[PDB]
Amino acid sequence: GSLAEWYQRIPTPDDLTRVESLFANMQAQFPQLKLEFKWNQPMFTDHGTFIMGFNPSKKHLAVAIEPQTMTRFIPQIDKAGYDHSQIIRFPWHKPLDEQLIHDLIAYTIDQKKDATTFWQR
């Protein structure tokens, strides 16, 4: 894909305006950032390192951030009223590491032993 085509996956003209303004404002606020197009999506990078990625869907703009950033901001993201998701991609065409999946479950079960809410806050 190209960057021209990605912009065309944004559902409506007002949605495109929102993304264009966001990009422009963030570039103005962080002049060192490079807006690259990599693995078929726009990403801000800084001195050859990932900062943020972007992908549209029918109902939302998905903003991609690093694991440590997500961890640090959970309280502030929840307060702002936005849902978040952390996923591992298991390709259909590759083996499924069930030991890994098992270990993720076991660790989470242990950490949430005394949880009083459905989601980690």
- Residues near Cl ion (CB under 5 A) are 117-119
Bridge-partner residues for 44, per DSSP? Answer: 35, 52
Longest dimension (CA), the chain: 49
CB of 48 to a copy of itself, least distance (A): 6
Span 50-109, contacts to a copy of itself by CB under 8 A: 50-52, 55, 59-74, 76-77, 80-94, 96-98, 100-109
- Judged by beta carbon distances under 5 to 8 A according to partner kind, the member of a copy of itself, Cl ion, none in contact with residue 18 is a copy of itself
Q: 70: left (phi > 0), else alpha (psi -120 to 50), else beta?
A: alpha
What is the three-class DSSP state of 3? helix
Binding pattern for the stretch 8-47 against a copy of itself, x by CB under 8 A and - elsewhere = ---xx-xx--x---x--xx--xx-xx----------xxxx
**Residue 103, amino acid:** D
CB of 101 to a copy of itself, least distance (A): 7
Q: Taking a C-beta distance cutoff of 8 angstroms, is the pair 119, 82 a contact?
A: no
2 or 58, CB closer to a copy of itself? 58
